[PDB]
Design a protein around this ligand. Structure first.
Ligand code: NA
Lengths: 171, 170
């Protein structure tokens, strides 16, 4: 099933390199610029969005009025929320780099994150645009056997759960 | 949907030819070598594994941190666990060769086994790498109309539930 996944526009923690999960940060001015550029570049399909501000605002600026779902949220980093990637203990760094065996104290395990995300995707009855987060887009791309890193304010379309269709980035 | 069915590395009962089901045997040094070789071939998809030691250890040495599911276990051979394939009553051999009519005392029925395996498979919500056992791999291959015999430490990728994608025999 055709699904478009949008990584929300940038927040301060992108340039700062801090782990951004459930911390509800707003978009930066450039983040809004990115979100606005998506208007007219995404298909007219039912829209769903993470309920976190940065996602919702991206969907709004993108000319959409999505139905909010917490299931589309970035992974919950727990105690690692706000920590600099640079200072993360190697065990966590490796876990995140290899996308496996990640269980932050007070947070959500990668396994639970994937289950949550994939269960939501399974429930979709028809093509739709999903305003979400880098980790969600990554989980989906990796499951489809490809590198999962995409720029803020960019999107990817996939034929779930079979293959990636296109990656769209704007300048 | 892409699923990789991985047969765990060899244990001592493989070279001995004994029925290996729920008996929790460890891998041999060669079994561990086979597991390590898989690290350079298996895709980095979500991983799942039988909770038995040989499967878990294979996943670990192959570079994965799998979610554990008993549904991925080999069939429970009951009193036949550890029995030499060579000495199995002709009726048992026949059934296991035809893959039907097998229910050992104190064990699982070949039917309840398949029921367990396919319920798990139909429940998957995304592509995955499954560290499991010979019987499970065989069940999946047979379901797709193919011969299901694969060597320990090898793998088979399938586009479930349509066809086999490729076999990886090292
Ligand atoms: Na026995």
């Amino acid at each position: 099933m055709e699904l478009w996944l949008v990584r929300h526009g940038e927040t301060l923690w992108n340039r700062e390199g801090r782990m951004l999960g459930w911390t509800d940060l707003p978009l930066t001015a450039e983040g809004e610029a990115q979100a606005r550029r998506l208007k007219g570049a995404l298909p007219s399909l039912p829209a769903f969005s993470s309920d976190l501000l940065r996602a919702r605002r991206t969907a709004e600026l993108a000319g959409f009025s999505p139905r909010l779902y917490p299931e589309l949220r970035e992974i919950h980093f727990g105690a690692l929320e706000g920590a600099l990637w640079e200072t993360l203990d190697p065990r966590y760094k490796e876990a995140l780099l290899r996308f496996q065996g990640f269980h932050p104290p007070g947070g959500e395990s990668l396994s639970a994150f994937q289950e949550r995300v994939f269960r939501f995707l399974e429930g979709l009855k028809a093509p739709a645009v999903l305003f979400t987060h880098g980790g969600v887009v990554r989980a989906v791309l990796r499951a489809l056997g490809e590198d999962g890193l995409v720029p803020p304010g960019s999107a990817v379309a996939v034929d779930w759960p079979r293959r990636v269709l296109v990656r769209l980035a704007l300048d």
